[PDB]
Amino acid sequence: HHHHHMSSKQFKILVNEDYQVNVPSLPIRDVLQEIKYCYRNGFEGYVFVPEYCRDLVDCDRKDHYVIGVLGNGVSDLKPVLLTEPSVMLQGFIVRANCNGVLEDFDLKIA
Numbered sequence: 001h002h003h004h005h006m007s008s009k010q011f012k013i014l015v016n017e018d019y020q021v022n023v024p025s026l027p028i029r030d031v032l033q034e035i036k037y038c039y040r041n042g043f044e045g046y047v048f049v050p051e052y053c054r055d056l057v058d059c060d061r062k063d064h065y066v067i068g069v070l071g072n073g074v075s076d077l078k079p080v081l082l083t084e085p086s087v088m089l090q091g092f093i094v095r096a097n098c099n100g101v102l103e104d105f106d107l108k109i110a
Contacts, residue, residue, distance in 0.1 A: 003095055008074045009039065010107040013093065014100040016047040020056050023094040025064035031079040039077065039109055043093060047100055050091040057094060059081055059110035070110065078110035 022106050026034060038046070047067070059066070059082055068080030070092040084090065 002014045008057050008106050011043055011105050011107060012102055013046065013048045015103045016049050016096060016098050016100045017053050018056075018100070019085055019096075020058065021049070021094065021096040021098055021099040022058040022060070023066065023096055025061045025066050026079075028065055028079050030064040031035070031066070031067065035077045035109060037080065037095070038067070039107070045095055045097075047098060048071045048091055048093050048095045048105070049102070051089045054082065054092070057092060065086075069093060069105070069107070071107050074108055076110035077107055 007072060065079040066082060068078050068084060070076045070078055070086060070088045070091070071090070075090055077093070080089070080092070
């Protein structure tokens with residue numbers, strides 16, 4: 001029998017809705033390892049950019065990946081391209097040093 005239990009972590013991440021940022025992207029194998037690192041150690045050095053603010057994110061390697069946040073409630077962390085069209089995309093967690101506001105995120109690995 002299935003039994004509901006907590007299987008995700010809570011993180012306080014800086015949210016960027018105001019500033020244009022140029023961010024690094026990675027090959028898919030490296031982003032999968034980076035998502036494991038962040039799930040264990042947190043998101044220092046990262047900001048979350050909501051999907052409605054996607055035009056704020058520049059990148060020199062559009063063929064490579066960033067951290068995507070997918071789904072409602074408990075969101076999944078998955079490698080995504082910045083052009084990801086999924087209607088389930090909440091936003092991106094990208095390396096940046098800009099100002100923002102603090103928000104809570106309930107996350108697990110895809």
